[PDB]
Amino acid sequence: KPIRALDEGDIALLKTYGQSTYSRQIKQVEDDIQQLLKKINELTGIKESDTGLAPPALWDLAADKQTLQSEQPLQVARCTKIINADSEDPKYIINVKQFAKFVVDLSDQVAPTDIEEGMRVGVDRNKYQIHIPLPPKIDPTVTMMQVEEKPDVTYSDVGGCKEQIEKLREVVETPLLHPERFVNLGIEPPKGVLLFGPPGTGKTLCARAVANRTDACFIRVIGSELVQKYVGEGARMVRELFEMARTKKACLIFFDEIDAIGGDNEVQRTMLELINQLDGFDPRGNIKVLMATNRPTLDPALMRPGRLDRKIEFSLPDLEGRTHIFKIHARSMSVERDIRFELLARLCPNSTGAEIRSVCTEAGMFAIRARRKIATEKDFLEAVNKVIKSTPRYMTYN
Amino acid sequence: RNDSYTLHKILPNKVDPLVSLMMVEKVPDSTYEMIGGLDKQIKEIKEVIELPVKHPEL
Amino acid sequence: EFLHAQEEVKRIQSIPLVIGQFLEAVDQNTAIVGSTTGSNYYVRILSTIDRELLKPNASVALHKHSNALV
Amino acid sequence: TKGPDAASKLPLVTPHTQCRLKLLKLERIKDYLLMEEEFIRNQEQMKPLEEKQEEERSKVDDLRGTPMSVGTLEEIIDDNHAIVSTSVGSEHYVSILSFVDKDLLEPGCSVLLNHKVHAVIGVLMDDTDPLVTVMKVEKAPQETYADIGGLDNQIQEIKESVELPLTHPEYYEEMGIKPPKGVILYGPPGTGKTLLAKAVANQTSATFLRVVGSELIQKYLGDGPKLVRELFRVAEEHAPSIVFIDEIDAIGTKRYDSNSGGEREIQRTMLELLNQLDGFDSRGDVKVIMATNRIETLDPALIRPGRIDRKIEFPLPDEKTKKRIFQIHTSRMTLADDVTLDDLIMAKDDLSGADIKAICTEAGLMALRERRMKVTNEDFKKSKENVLYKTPEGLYL
Ligand SMILES: Nc1ncnc2c1ncn2[C@@H]1O[C@H](COP(=O)(O)OP(=O)(O)OP(=O)(O)O)[C@@H](O)[C@H]1O
Ligand SMILES: Nc1ncnc2c1ncn2[C@@H]1O[C@H](COP(=O)(O)OP(=O)(O)O)[C@@H](O)[C@H]1O
Ligand SMILES: [Mg+2]
DSSP, rough: OOOOOHHHHHHHHHHHSOOOTTTHHHHHHHHHHHHHHHHHHHHOOOOOOOOOOOOOOOHHHHHHHHHHHOOOOOOEEEEOOOOOOOOTOOOOOOTTTSSSSEEEEEEETGGGGOOOOEEEEOOOOOSEEEEEOOOOOOOTTSOOOOOSSOOOOOGGGOOOOOOHHHHHHHHHHHHHHOOHHHHHOOOOOOEEEEOOOTTTTTTHHHHOOOOHTTEEEEEEEHHHHHHHOOOSSSHHHHHHHHHHHSSSSOOOEETTHHHHHHHHHHHHHHHHHHHHHHHHHHSSSSSOOEEESSOOOHHHTTTTTTTTTTEEOOOOOHHHHHHHHHHHHHSSSSSSSSOOOHHHHHHHOOHHHHHHHHHHHHHHHHHTTTTTBBBBHHHHHHHHHHHHTTTTTTSOOO | OOSSSOOOOOOOOOOOHHHHTOOOOSSSOOGGGGOOSSSHHHHHHHHHHHHHHHHHTO | OEEEEEEEEHHTSSSSSEEEEEEEEEEESSEEEEETTTEEEEEEOOOOGGGOOOOTTEEEEEETTTTOOO | OOOOOOOOOOOOOOOOOSSSHHHHHHHHHHHHHHHHHHHHHHHHHOOOOOOOOHHHHHHHHHOSSSSSSEEEEEEEEEEEEEEETTTOOEEEEEEEEEOOTTTOTTTTEEEEEESSEEEEEEEEEEOOOHHHHBBBBSOOOOTTTTTOOOOOHHHHHHHHITTTTTTOHHHHHHHHHOOOOEEEEEOOTTTSSHHHHHHHHOOOOSSSEOOOTTTTOOSSSSSHHHHHHHHHHHHHHHSEEEEEOOOOOHBBBBBOOOOOOHHHHHHHHHHHHHHHHHHHHTTTSSSEEEEEEEEGGGGGTOOTTEEEEEEEEEOOOOHHHHHHHHHHHTTSSSSOOSOOOHHHHOOOSSOOOOHHHHHHHHHHHHHTTHHHHHHOHHHHHHHHHHHHOOOOOOOOO
């Protein structure tokens, strides 16, 4: 049936008749409210907008003007191949960022010994002479770094990696704290070791655990940090890091998620710098390196013998390991003292350690849901039901 | 300004040409009288296109 | 004097000129033009240009040193 | 640091039958808005206060010059020189003038520089580029938890994630569980994920930032990660805050070896987003909410327990939730006494909140077709198959 479009009289009668008596007043009032809101919003202004002006009496405006009229700015750049100067060809080609690259010479104020390939250099703007090398500095405040000297994770805080922790002990504790046995055995202590396994197995903290018990400082370096914005200078960064590794009495240098690097000009520069630092530093030293990855993408030039002596697989935790992790993470939360953690570890087959920590977190979540200050075994049951498993298994298996 | 960078005029709001061209400035010549059938379809369109716009009061 | 002024106006339309896109007309004599150097400029439209020929995104030749829509 | 944002007006929404209780409350609100307007117009009418220091400020302005370009303080050197990047991307080794607040200088904060011979002459704590300013919510959405039907478990979870740490959090550290840093809602389209985000932004006490996911990607090199960094820096600066990134799969797809420059830039932007997510401690009062339909297509690193612990499921509404949504959306309708609405719900289908809203809208349209506004049950009967477009019959019986 052809439906009729509303006519003018139809529209006019629709807006009336079946209307609330207060339609006009209410709609108008809401419109004025919105208009007044926009009025206030436009008239209230912005305010400061207070620039970084120091308190007075700290101002040397005379000297400030002197610097403005005397000192000059320098564009920074990443210096590249030295062109084999030998005091007669001191030119280097430098890449000023997204700007061009120029072959330039030095300023009289810098010796060539201070300038080398791959360091940030501040240069002038017309002659582009390298005026001052600009080392990127090292500080845990920037990026993320080792930020640890004596980790608070002990051998009692690790579980499920008994064979793995034993292998790690042979790797690090035996050459470091017992060099005499390696020396009189006439065997080079393990120069390189790799710790491969799925993420969340626990790998990092395991090393951190031994880092507390090896009486040496722990180093955390993230491969993504080397590959993200902190790329380029990162080589020099690790240079300084390796340098400070030499300064300390013993360093447990470890790189997190090396997959971001092991699998790219500046990335290759950082890699070859790592190769020089490892193959160059004397294997008899005490700064033994711990390597770990999730994807066993590593370049074939790395695991050649003499760079990675041992490989350790960190498999998923077993029943004893999973229940140990459950108890460890329950030590830090308010629960009853009669929780069957063996039950839960059974209920979490092939579950990562991070998954166990999340399970404990969700158990606390459920306890909070009922506003009970003590988490119950029921709470952990719902937590594992939620996290793990992301009729069939009960109507056929019994 | 030239290179003093002084705000000296306020211009209409920024619309880059790639979308500024998508206005139908020159309306096409096609009427419903040139559309056979589709009367039900035309009504269903009109109930969504201009009926909400012409009179949102209903 | 009018002849000389017409000569000068015609001379301002000499070559080279940078190509740009007529983004938007602002006044009867001033527009916003996107010069293919990649930059948007608020410039002045020359009078003799046919106004009806000024459509958005149309290619327009601008003075090299002043970006005036020539 | 500063405080949160997103000011909103009165809920009102206590009456809806337009019974002058609405009129009285709205008149009170309008009266207060009028006193706003009059008070500030009077205060601007008489407010003589200026000059004072003048000369020192005048000479410092002369030293600064005009214009002054803003850059990003990428790094600092001995406390007279720094490294500052112009918005183009070029950074320079410049000098720092005395009148700058050496305590304010940190890697990242915007620095006012001299146009010629670049030199740090000021610090701007409110750069907030127009894009990220847009992503910050100013007017709270009118939707609220009253408008949400069902999803009681979902509402409970989202409040336990983003509200309980904001309100009294003592339960969290009392149990010692770290608060859930970030939450991802997911489910079939039109289940209510964005609606729940709106309701959160309504009943809130923190800066709400709405993002589109695809908004983050920017054409210019490094603009993407820079914008993501700016967004999260604004989140920290106006902490506590909630960062809602709708349609996370716009960037959240599985990471693969990039080939072209654009795909490398997309990988960089997601890497920066992940780095920013890791950057702030979970004990911090900044949370993120990411919604998506294709959860299965997300990178299995973004949803790691160390990055996003929770995973809220938005399943298709049940029959009771369906009737709840029908009641909600039919609240403003003048339904007759013949309507039952039970037949539509009982029909085994895959109606969603959006589907039910559209069914109500189409039923209203059908009623308007018959020149009525009371909306019979037959109107809903027609509307259901009108909007629900598209097992071989007797195969299963
Ligand atoms: N539980 C509900 N109660 C009431 N209305 C609902 C409900 N769920 C959804 N809706 C309605 O659905 C509309 C669209 O929902 P919303 O924008 O949240 O979709 P979504 O599920 O996030 O989907 P998508 O992200 O795929 O667009 C809302 O405006 C609301 O009116
Ligand atoms: N053997 C273990 N002992 C104690 N905790 C563990 C163990 N394995 C895993 N975990 C838990 O898993 C979480 C994440 O482990 P992490 O070291 O970050 O994984 P990855 O080895 O991938 O870096 C930690 O918070 C820790 O609580
Ligand atoms: Mg949605």
